[model samples]
Target: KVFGRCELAAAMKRHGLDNYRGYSLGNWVCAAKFESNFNTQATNRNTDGSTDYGILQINSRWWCNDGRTPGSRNLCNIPCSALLSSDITASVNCAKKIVSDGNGMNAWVAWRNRCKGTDVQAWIRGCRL
Candidate 1:
């Protein structure tokens, strides 16, 4: 199914909360939503003249900043923007790797409570993924 910006933003927000330990989930969700619009393939040109790509808005420099090379599954793929030119799921997975382990669901709930201004990280410790 196709997902809209808000839906994807919510998903990204959820994922953000999962890894942002000791930080405000609400703050992170707000940041992630603003960053990617939850679009795994989103791209934006920054004021610094660099391009940002992927779900978490990762820059090409992180992976590599080369020209002419398209996105690839190869680890050496420079110009990370090529990464977004390829598969979005890979970009999201890449984001998860950069953050914590894959923990979208936990992050979702964490953000939910945090949005309400309640901090209860320990309460959901036993909850299954």
Candidate 2:
């Protein structure tokens, strides 16, 4: 398991994600919470037969290779398992790429559903960074 929300925010700040691509850190943190509860090993099987990987719940259909999933775009060019680790370097990189590809945070359904048009200040309320 990874650290708590504050530590995650610190890490995100260290990775220059406090204001990445014009998206707020709170949105990122909120999305991560809804996606994986900050657990790197989190995985969810979608109804569409696609699996979401790691903390960001990136999809096997578009982002990463899950081996068994065919027709994966594999846009990240990394194994989906790479995201399922305590160290979030790969996941963060891949997520950044996803955000930069014109999708913004809208790429994540969790973000769209839980964070969009909402005040997410509580996600970073106690985190000083």
Candidate 3:
């Protein structure tokens, strides 16, 4: 599923990601905007040989295990394929773990360049959440 901007916002907010680890709802939405454009099946293979998965582009090197990354921590204990679902449950839960592990939203460089300290409320402008 390629979610609309506000659709992704509502979904993430419902999963309690708003203001998670001091990152705002807009920040999260913005990260998704630049990372995968809210694409549920989006995947990127990095130059470092790590693959990023799903809407937030969770990394294979540390979060979800692709069974391919050499030193995968699999901190979320989830298969990398699970992050590609339209339901988003695995992605959201794993996202929480990423933040809990202290990486916060900074784990995504896309968030750093496009979301950090920026006013991204437009990402969720009409979302009821």
Candidate 4:
């Protein structure tokens, strides 16, 4: 969760969120608390017993293309692919892309406050990409 200053700023900026130059401590921690309980390595099992993976729960199986294997290449392998081919930061950045597109920065903001904060509609006007 400690991605340093410059990287942290870059990560936040990439998500269409604020670029506080390392000032997202509140938002970052709060978002982590709200979403997946700040667990970067969380996962859930589907009805068919398929698995999800990672802190943002990227559903490796689906992102990797929905194929299963005993170390075989499948759709479920994409999430970790970022980590293997790139780095954990890359995987995280990729997750942020999916999050920004799926839920928006307000979701992260709300999650930071444990959903006890302002609704997205009230703050959407101020959001910038």
In terms of TM-score, how similar is model 3 to the real structure?
Answer: 0.93
Poorest lDDT segment (10 consecutive residues) of candidate 3? 99-108
User: Best-fitting candidate, measured by lDDT?
Assistant: 3
Winner of 1 and 3 under TM-score: 3
The better-scoring model by lDDT among 2 and 3 is 3
Task: Kindly report which residue stretches of model 1 are placed more than 4 angstroms away from their true locations once superposed.
Answer: 5-29, 64-87, 100-129
Candidate 2 runs further than 4 Å off: none
TM-score of 4: 0.42
- TM-score to true structure, per model: 0.42, 0.94, 0.93, 0.42
Model 3 clash count equals: 0
- Candidate 3 lDDT over residue span 7-58, tens digit each: 8888998888998877789988898989998899999999989999999999
TM-score of 2: 0.94
lDDT of 4 by residue, 4-119 (tens): 33443345456544433322434543444445454445556555545554434444443544345234334323535343331245445554555555454443443545543534
Cα-based lDDT for every prediction? 0.47, 0.88, 0.88, 0.44
